[PDB]
Amino acid sequence: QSLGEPATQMTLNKNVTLGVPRLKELINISKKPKTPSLTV
Amino acid sequence: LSTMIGKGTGAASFDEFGNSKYQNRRTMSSSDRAMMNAFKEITTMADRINLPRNIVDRTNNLFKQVYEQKSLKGRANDAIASACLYIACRQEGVPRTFKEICAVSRISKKEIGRCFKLILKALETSVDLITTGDFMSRFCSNLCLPKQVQMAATHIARKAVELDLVPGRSPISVAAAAIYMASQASAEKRTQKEIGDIAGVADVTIRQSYRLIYPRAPDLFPTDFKF
């Protein structure tokens, strides 16, 4: 609950994806990410 | 207690020839099928003359009592159906004529008369004798006549019944005679053919009632009519 309560406050969907779709893409292992990226 | 098997969503239920291999057998006895067809006939018969559903439900009640009485198997179910329609129309105080039932039924007047005679003999009930005043409102309204014509014709019919000008005459004939009375005294006028069309009695019967009711005419009229 202390993780998912900071999920009803940020918005939905030159940067990678971020927000509730990122949370859904992280807690699912998501074999096909929408914008996977490196930092070299 | 039953269930219906519907059409298949997926194509995995179809055989090589189609036909989906799974369909409703719809057995539901024979007697229930007969009652269902009879109720369908009653509804589509009563909708034609626009009867309220209370008369339809009373007709269904009489049909179920007759069908469970088990005495009228030798006659067409449609005859018992129209007979129960006549009984239910009688018992609500709004009787229809036999010809009006015969118009919306596939059955002759002889058969419906005999079936009505057997229903009253078998189910052991009593029905009120018809009076002329029951038909007056339907006849005037379907002929599109105003309220003063209605009241005058009803008064004429009831006075002709009580004073005894018409021994043994049918109430339908003297009712249409009272219609012709109220019609041929005002601005609007109705021809013999229209009266026979709306009443079912023949024009000869209207002339018989006319020529027999014509003496003592002002006594049959109400107090004021605006001649």
């Binding site: - | 589509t44 909708d47 039924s105």
Partner: protein, 92 residues
């Protein structure tokens, strides 16, 4: 249109049933007045727009709460996009 097709099918079945036996048929009893008078009633009453998988909620009870409510209910539109679907584009 669909219900007149149904009525024509019904009078066709009736006319066949009294023409195979070899006699004329009366047209007045042939036409079932139940069909058109009941199906339009059923569809406007229930809001299910078909002969019971069809569109649902087409017809609603009028919102007599204030005059603005009545006008806004009479001048309303409705999209068929599945209302539970977690889409974003058509709603904008």
């Amino acid at each position: 249109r669909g219900m007149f097709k149904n009525l024509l099918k019904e009078v066709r079945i009736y006319a066949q049933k009294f023409i195979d036996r070899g006699k004329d048929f009366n047209l007045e009893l042939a036409i079932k007045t139940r069909i058109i008078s009941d199906g339009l009633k059923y569809s406007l009453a229930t809001g299910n727009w078909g002969d019971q998988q069809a569109r649902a909620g087409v017809s609603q009870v009028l919102n007599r709460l204030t005059f603005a409510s009545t006008l806004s209910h009479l001048r309303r539109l409705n999209s068929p996009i599945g209302r539970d679907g977690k889409l974003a584009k058509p709603r904008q």
